[PDB]
Amino acid sequence: FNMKLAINAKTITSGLKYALATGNWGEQKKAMSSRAGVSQVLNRYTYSSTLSHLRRTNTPIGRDGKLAKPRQLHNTHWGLVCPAETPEGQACGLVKNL
Amino acid sequence: DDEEEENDDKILKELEDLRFRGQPGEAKDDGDELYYQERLKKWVKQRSCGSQRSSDLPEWRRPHPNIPDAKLNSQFKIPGEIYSLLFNYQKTCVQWLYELYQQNCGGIIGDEMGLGKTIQVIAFIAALHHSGLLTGPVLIVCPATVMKQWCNEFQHWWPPLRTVILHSMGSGMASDHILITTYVGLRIHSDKLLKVKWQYAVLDEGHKIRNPDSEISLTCKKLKTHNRIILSGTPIQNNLTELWSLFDFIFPGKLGTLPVFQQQFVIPINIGGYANATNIQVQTGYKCAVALRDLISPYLLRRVKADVAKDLPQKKEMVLFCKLTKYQRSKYLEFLHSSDLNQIQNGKRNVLFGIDILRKICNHPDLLDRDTKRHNPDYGDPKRSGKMQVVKQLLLLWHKQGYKALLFTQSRQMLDILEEFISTKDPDLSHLNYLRMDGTTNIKGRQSLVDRFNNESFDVFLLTTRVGGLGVNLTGANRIIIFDPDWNPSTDMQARERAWRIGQKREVSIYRLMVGGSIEEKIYHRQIFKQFLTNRILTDPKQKRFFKIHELHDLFSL
Amino acid sequence: LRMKHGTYDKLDDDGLIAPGVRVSGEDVIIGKTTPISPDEEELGQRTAY
Amino acid sequence: MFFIKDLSLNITLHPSFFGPRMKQYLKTKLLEEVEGSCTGKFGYILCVLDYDNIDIQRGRILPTDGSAEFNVKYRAVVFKPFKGEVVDGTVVSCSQHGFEVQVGPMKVFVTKHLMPQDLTFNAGSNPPSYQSSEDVITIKSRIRVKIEGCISQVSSIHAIGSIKEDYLGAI
Amino acid sequence: HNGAPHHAIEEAESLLQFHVATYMDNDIAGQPQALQKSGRPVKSIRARLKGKEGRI
RNA sequence: AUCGAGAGGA
DNA sequence: CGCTCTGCTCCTTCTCCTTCCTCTCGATGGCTATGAGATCAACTAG
DNA sequence: CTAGTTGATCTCATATTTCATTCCTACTCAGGAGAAGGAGCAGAGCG
């Protein structure tokens, strides 16, 4: 066992490295249960971009692309997420900043 | 016989066209086919019409006008003169061939090399032709170098027999009895030839049809005749499926199909290697495989050389051992650590052929690359391989002792590296005169080199295991070294038997270089287990010695 | 083989450009080669490497 | 067999060649490209008729190219053979390898098996001739040929023949 | 060729049919999404010739 | 090079 | 008036479906493979 | 024209009988609209 476990220590190491490097939060098998985009390259265009990236969120629900009441500025968001900082395009209202 | 339509010829004279210069080639091919069918221009020399087949027959009629000893002198159901000429176990062999002929199913015969596999069957064929009044046809298959032999014995003992060579012959089926061909020739002639239904079909190199899936074995199988026989040079060497294929060719209906055999007729746990309900190890697998061996014994013959050839000086199983150098050990560990990409990558230079990388590290770490020319000026370097040092020591000892040494090597790259080493790298070995051989050597040159070795003034004869069959006679050898595990045990037997032909009065010491703790020892263990399986299926001893395959199979990978 | 159309005259013996050199266009900044096949002695008869 | 058939060939014409002399150039180009041509559809193009009265319609400019493509209509004389058909050809040569005859633009061919069984080759005759049977066939004589096959080459059309029967003898 | 049992021949026929079908169209509204060794669905000819960026 | 993913822009 | 038939209605399955441009990061690694032996062709010379 | 020699290519090949196993692990995260196909039913004509 002393070395049989060490054979699969690469399992832990490479699994964590894959999950964080690629963003596919699964086991790296077939994008199974993948949440591609969980981990992103830290933006460093300027200081404000870095700070905003480090304080960002994401709603997987809207990835389906549905057009309905969600991805709107609910008023329970008062004082918890920025009412103005939200991207354009598909992610408007699904990406929110604390 | 040029039957080409003259219409196209006079059209060509009307307007010649050089673009159809391949049409002459097609016509040559068609003429060759028509030769093999019913014609021949200059191929009478290949034991065909114009030879003893239909021309020199009178040379034998005066001594016996179509009435040989099988008919005139001591006439019986069998010949009388040949039997007197025949030796012990040969008359019995022909008698059992006669029994099998009455059985009208087939058979398989073979004795230890040098005991006359080629003989004892020509006599039986002649007996059937004359005493048995067998009109034929009779078929033989073997390599051309052995086809010339078969023809020589045929024309020597039994001139009246009509035998011919299916290499570059003609007429054949167009004329009347016996036909000899090559296995590759058999593949080429997938035409009606397979439908001839050769009454007496006999295959010489049964070892060449061991694999059921091999094209040679299946091609022979399609040619079904009431009496099909195999003269395998050696019995089972790799798997019992080989014996299944042989028996199916000779005795299809007397044994089960491939499944029945593999799931049941398999000495390993398949048949109950622990038939006594003992450890899953294959140590008590008897009364089931032994039953199959006893069932097949009424269909196989075997004479041990010791039976009549007791004049065989001592053999030596001296397994040398080597030490892996620090450079070699470092590269070995590096590969082992980096080998696991898919952990087998379907082999492909990791396990199945990563064994090749390990072997290259063991033997020629200095020139471990396809682009050896970049390192050739400074390499090989024996300092990186202690096996080379051991070889140098043994060769120098045998040179000072004046022993003709045989060296058996792996793929020709290692051969050339060793040649360069001995010739230039070490002046000590340069003083020794040496000889060379490879698979690319010409047949005439191969025979010349063999003759030189048998009476050589040289010291070292570097040889490759695979080249040449059992016919290569190297009785002049006085010492033997095996450079690495030569895979199939049959190859090892052939290599150690290069010196051991009929003769070889001077004792020969056989050595096998080995690296302690390396995968080579594991390969040797696998070969030992293969030999144990061969012994079990051949003699059925109560051998409890059994390497623990249940874990050693995976251990042997690396 | 197929050595790029840019300028190699700006590289050093290390296969790198010394800092302070003015590089423009498709000039080569890192010089790296693959001593790989074809492993043919015919090529040795031709250009050695 | 000789017969007259209609023809319709498409001619492209480079714009630089457009001009008052266009019709003459069209006629020249077609007559040089067609007269004596070999075709498997129509054998040999022997003669183009009504050279004065030629209906060229008149053609169209290619979409992305200024060149003009013309479909010129014709009545033309052509010759083709038929299997089973008898031709009164003129001999050209004789040989033990076979016998061949000329028919206008085509050369008929006769096989060893298509001469009379009694008509063997006499190489000793000068010129070589089929003197075996009562009907002597010489190289410069004339003979009827019984066609049993058409041989097609891109550069020429050929055919086979037979002289077995009496009515197929020398003329 | 070797006179294999009925069920083995049936299985081989089904496997060949499945591979051919996936080759022409690797989306059959069924469970067996044929996929490559690397873990990516095979790009059938239908997939190449279908949809935006789809050869038409 | 390929494919996949993410970021953003009109 | 019971039988049968049939179209008519309704209710589940059962698929199949959304301009253009530019960056960067990374994960694929390649799905066949012994050399020998034997045959064929290609070069060569009389 | 052709027989000889030699380079070149084609097929050979088979595994060796085998450990051995877990099992298969599930959250996030579609649904929307339309065709299709069956299933039931009720009445109308029959016997």
Sign, CA dihedral B364-B367-B373-B375, equals negative
CATH number at residue D129: 2.40.50.140
| Residues from B in contact with E at Cβ < 8 Å | 257-258
Which residue numbers of B have CB closer than 8 Å to D's CBs? 5-7, 9-11, 13-15
Tokens encoding B513: 């270089």
Residues of D with CB below 8 A from B10's CB? Answer: 95, 97-98, 100, 109
- E38 contacts chain B (CB < 8 A): no
CA angle B391, B395, B401 (to 5 degrees): 150
Among D48, D63, D84, give the residue marking a domain's end: D84
Enter the tokens of residue D43: 């054998």
CA distance B314 to B319: 16
Cα separation, B527 vs B547, in Å, equals: 11
Q: What spatial distance separates the first Cα and last Cα of chain D, rounded to whole Å?
A: 19
CA distance B480 to B407: 6
Establish, for the pair of chains A and E, how many residue pairs have beta carbons separated by less than 8 Å.
Answer: 5
Please name every residue paired with A95 in a beta bridge, in sequence order, or none if there are none.
A92
The neighbour count for residue B483, using CB atoms within 10 Å, is 25
- Amino acid code (one letter) for B226: H
Task: Please give the biggest Cα pair distance in chain A.
Answer: 57
Size of interface B-D (CB pairs under 8 A): 25
Quickly count: other Cβ atoms within 10 Å of residue B507's Cβ: 13
- Distance in angstroms (rounded) separating the CA atoms of residues B185 and A82: 86
What tokens were used for B473? Answer: 């006679």
Residues D75 and D116 occupy one common structural domain: no
Describe chain C by its helix, strand, coil percentages, rounded to 5: 10, 5, 85
Residue in B166, B70, B75, B196 with CA at minimum distance from that of residue B122: B70
Alpha-carbon distance of B418 to B363, in angstroms, equals 10
Q: CA triplet B326, B330, B334: central angle to 5 degrees? A: 170
Contacts of A64 (CB under 8 A, 6+ apart): none
Cite the DSSP H helix spans in B401-459. 412-420, 427-430, 443-454
Instruction: Answer yes or no: do D74 and D6 share one domain.
Output: yes
Count CA atoms within 13 Å of residue A45 on its CB side.
Answer: 4
Q: Which amino acid is residue B382, in one-letter code? A: P
Angle at B9 between CA B7 and CA B14, to 5 degrees: 95
Residue B343: left if φ>0, alpha if ψ -120 to 50, beta else—which one?
left
CA distance C21 to C12: 11
Which positions in strand G are less than 7 Å from the protein's CB atoms?
A: 14-16, 18-20, 24-40
Listed in sequence order, the residues at least 6 apart from B209 whose beta carbon sits closer than 8 Å to its beta carbon are B183, B203, B216, B217, B220, B230, B245, B246, B249
Separation in Å: H4 C1' and B440 CA: 18
Please judge whether B373 and C41 are an interchain contact, meaning their C-beta atoms are less than 8 angstroms apart.
yes
Identify the chains in contact with E, defined as 3+ C-beta pairs within 8 A. A, B
List, in sequence order, every residue forming a beta bridge with B301; answer none if it has no partner: B109
Instruction: Indicate the helix (H) or strand (E) that contains B109.
Output: strand B106-109
Q: What are phi and psi of B191, to 5 degrees?
A: -80, -165
In chain A, residues with a C-beta closer than 8 Å to the C-beta of E40 are 30
CB B519 within 8 A of CB B558: yes
Distance (Å, rounded) from C-alpha B202 to C-alpha B108?
9
For B192, phi and psi rounded to 5 degrees?
A: -40, -30
Nucleotide nearest to B280 (CA to C1'): H19
Parallel, antiparallel or unpaired: strands D60-61 and D38-39: unpaired
In 3-state terms, chain A is what percent helix, strand and coil (to 5)? Answer: 40, 5, 60
Shortest CA distance from B370: residue in chain C: C39
Q: Are residues D66 and D15 in the same domain?
A: yes
Co-location of D74 and D102 in the same domain: no
Nearest CA in chain B to C39: B371
B326 CA, G36 C1': separation in Å? 35
Tokens of B417: 């590296």
DSSP B421: I
**Structural domains of chain D, count:** 2
Name every residue whose Cβ is closer than 8 Å to that of residue D79 and which is 6 or more positions away in sequence.
Answer: D1, D2, D3, D43, D44, D46, D103, D104, D105, D106
Q: What is the 3-state secondary structure (H, E, C) of chain D?
A: CEEEEEEEEEEEECHHHCCCCHHHHHHHHHHHHHCCCEECCCEEEEEECCCCCCECCCCEECCCCCCEEEEEEEEEEEECCCCCEEEEEEEEEEECCEEEEEECCEEEEECCCCCCCCCCCECCCCCCEECCCCCCECCCCEEEEEECEEEECCCCEEEEECCCCHHHCEC
Q: Which helix (H) or strand (E) holds B511?
A: strand B509-512
Structure tokens at B553: 């199979």
- Distance, in Å, from the CA atom of A43 to the CA atom of A56, rounded to the nearest integer, reads 12
Coil vs helix vs strand at B179: strand
3-state secondary structure of A92: strand
Q: Which two tokens stand for residue D52?
A: 């004065």
Rounded distance between C-alpha atoms, residue B73 and residue A57, angstroms: 109
∠ CA B416-B418-B424, rounded to 5°: 95
Question: Which residues sit opposite B166 in a β-bridge?
Answer: B181
D66, D84, D102 - which closes a domain: D84
Flag if B10 and D112 touch (Cβ within 8 Å): no
Q: Are D105 and D44 in contact (CB under 8 A)?
A: yes
Contact B360, B297 (CB under 8 A): no
d(CA B239, CA B267): 10
Q: Which of A's residues 62-91 have CB atoms within 7 A of nucleic strand H?
A: 63-64, 66
- In the structure encoding, which two tokens stand for residue A87, read together? 């991207």
Proportion of chain B in helix, strand, coil states, percent, rounded to 5: 45, 10, 45
Nucleotide nearest to B348 (CA to C1'): G33
CA distance D137 to D170: 6
Q: What is the C-alpha separation between D52 and D128, in angstroms, rounded?
A: 48
Q: How many Å lie between the alpha carbon of E1 and the closest alpha carbon of chain B? A: 12
Chain B contacts of C44, Cβ < 8 Å?
373
Q: Is D169 found in the same domain as D101?
A: yes
Classify each residue of A35-70 as buried b or exposed e, where b means 16 or more C-beta atoms within 10 Å of its C-beta: eeeeeeeeeeeeeeeeeeeeeeeeeeebeeeeeeee
Give the contacts of B547 (CB within 8 A, at least 6 positions apart). B525, B528, B529
Q: What residues does B138 pair with on adjacent strands?
A: B178, B200
CB contact under 8 A, D109 and B5: no
Using CA atoms in the order D56, D62, D65, D71, what is the torsion angle rounded to 10 degrees? Answer: -30
Residues belonging to chain E: 56
Give kind and range of the element (H or E) at residue B537: helix B519-539
A39 strand G contact, CB < 7 Å: no
Rounded Cα–Cα distance for residues C20 and C37 (Å): 36
Mark whether D171 and D89 lie in a shared domain.
yes
Token pair, residue B534, equals 């061969």
Q: In which residue are the tokens 């054998």 written? A: D43
Q: What is the 3-state secondary structure (H, E, C) of B229-273?
A: EECCCCCCCCCHHHHHHHHHHHCCCCCCCHHHHHHHCCCCHHHCC
Contact between the CB of B207 and strand H at under 7 Å: no
Exposure string of B139-154, with b = 16+ CB inside 10 Å and e = fewer, is bbbbbbebbebbbebb
Four-CA torsion B95, B101, B106, B109, nearest 10 degrees:
20
CB contact under 8 A, D111 and B5: yes
- From D94, which residue of chain B is nearest by alpha-carbon distance? B10
Where do we find the tokens 């190890």?
B281
Q: Which of D84, D108, D129 is the last residue of a domain?
A: D84
Assess whether A18 (CB) lies less than 7 A from strand G: yes
Phi and psi dihedrals of B141, rounded to 5? Answer: -135, 130
The SS3 of residue C30 is strand
Distance CA B150, CA B120 (A): 12
Nearest CA in chain E to A29: E39
Residues D64 and D126 in one domain: no
- Collapse the DSSP code of B209 into the 3-class scheme (helix H, G, I; strand E, B; otherwise coil) and give the result: helix
Candidates B386, B382, B332; CA nearest to B357 is B332
In E, which residues are within 8 Å of B258 by CB distance? 2
Angle at B468 between CA B512 and CA B497, to 5 degrees: 40
Contact B466, B491 (CB under 8 A): yes
Element (H, E) at B461: strand B460-464
**Cβ–Cβ under 8 Å, residues B244 and B230:** no
Which stretch of DSSP H or E encloses residue B202?
A: strand B200-203
Asked whether the beta carbons of B380 and B425 are under 8 A apart, the reply is yes
Residue E11 CB coordination number (10 Å): 12
C-alpha angle C11/C14/C19, rounded to 5°? 55
Q: Kindly report the backbone phi and psi dihedral angles of residue B522, in degrees, each rounded to the nearest multiple of 5, phi listed first.
A: -65, -40
What's the CA E30/C1' G9 distance, rounded, in angstroms?
A: 31
**Residues with Cβ within 8 Å of residue D99, at least 6 apart in sequence:** D109, D110, D115, D130, D137, D163
Query: How far is it, in rounded angstroms, from Cα B412 to Cα B377?
Result: 19
Please give the structure tokens belonging to residue D76.
């033309």
Burial D91-116 (b: 16+ CB within 10 A, else e): bebbeebbbbbbbeebbbbbbeebbb
Does the CB of C47 have a partner CB in chain B at under 8 Å? no
Query: What is the layout of strands, in order, in the sheet containing D98-103?
Result: D142-147, D85-95, D98-103, D106-110, D157-161, D149-152
Q: How far is CA B132 from the centre of its chain?
A: 32
Helix (H, G, I), strand (E, B) or coil at C16: strand
C44 in B contact zone (CB under 8 Å): yes
The separation, in Å, between residue B370 CA and nucleotide G27 C1' comes to 29
Give me the CATH number covering residue D38: 3.30.1490.120
Nearest-angstrom CA–CA distance, B421 and B10? 66
Per the structure, the complete domain to which residue D152 belongs is given by 85-171
How far is the alpha carbon of A24 from chain E, nearest alpha carbon, in Å? 14
Cross-chain residue pair D100–B14, CB shorter than 8 Å:
yes
Instruction: Tell how strand D157-161 and strand D149-152 pair up.
Output: antiparallel
Please enumerate, as own/partner, the contacts of B1-5 that have beta carbons within 8 Å and a separation of 24 or more: B1/B31, B1/B34, B1/B39, B2/B31, B3/B34, B5/D111
Identify the closest residue of chain E to A30 by CA–CA distance: E39
What are phi and psi for residue B466, nearest 5 degrees?
Answer: -70, -35
- Please tell me the distance from the alpha carbon of residue E53 to that of residue E56, in angstroms, as a whole number: 7
Query: What is d(CA B93, CA B82) in angstroms, rounded to the nearest whole number?
Result: 13
For A39, which DSSP code? S
Which of A22, A30, A33 best probes binding to E when mutated, by most E CB atoms within 10 angstroms?
Answer: A30
- CA B482 distance to own-chain centroid: 19
Contacts of B373 in chain C (CB under 8 A): 41, 44
CA distance readout (Å), C7 to C12, C13, C23, C30, C32: 12, 14, 10, 11, 14
| Distance in angstroms (rounded) separating the CA atoms of residues A93 and B520 | 66
Closest listed residue to residue B69, CA positions, set B57, B56, B78, B59: B78
CB-based contacts with strand F under 7 Å?
Answer: A 23, 31, 36-37, 40, 43, 87-89, 91, 95; E 40
CA dihedral A74, A75, A81, A82 (to 10 degrees): 100
Cβ B200 vs Cβ B139: under 8 Å: yes
Which chains, if any, share at least 3 CB pairs under 8 A with chain B?
C, D, E
- Classify residue B85 by its DSSP letter: H
Sign of CA pseudo-dihedral B142, B534, B302, B116: positive
Geometric angle at alpha carbon A11, from A8 and A15, rounded to 5°: 175
Torsion angle of the four alpha carbons A67, A70, A75, A80, in this order, in degrees rounded to the nearest 10: -120
**β-pairing verdict for D157-161 and D68-79:** unpaired
Strand H, CB < 7 A, residues 507-546 of B: 529-530, 533
Contact C44 B370 (CB under 8 A): no
Chains near C, with 3+ CB pairs < 8 A? B
Whether C42 and chain B come into contact, CB under 8 Å, resolves to: no
- Say yes or no: Cβ of B189 under 7 A from any atom of strand G: no
CA distance B342 to B355: 16
* Nearest residue, CB atoms, B11 vs list D96, D109, D112: D109
* Candidates D91, D93, D97, D155, partner chain B, best to mutate (most B CBs within 10 A): D97
> Token pair of A58, please?
């994401």
CA–CA distance, A18 with A35 (Å, rounded to integer): 13
Give the technique used to solve this structure: cryo-EM
Using a threshold of 3 CB pairs under 8 A, tell whether chains D and B touch.
Answer: yes
Q: Tokens for D19? A: 């001009």
Partners of D70 in the beta sheet? Answer: D11
Question: String of b and e for B163-175 (b: at least 16 CB within 10 Å)?
Answer: bbbbebbbbbeee
What radius of gyration do chain E's Cα atoms show? 15
Token code pair at residue B194: 């397979």
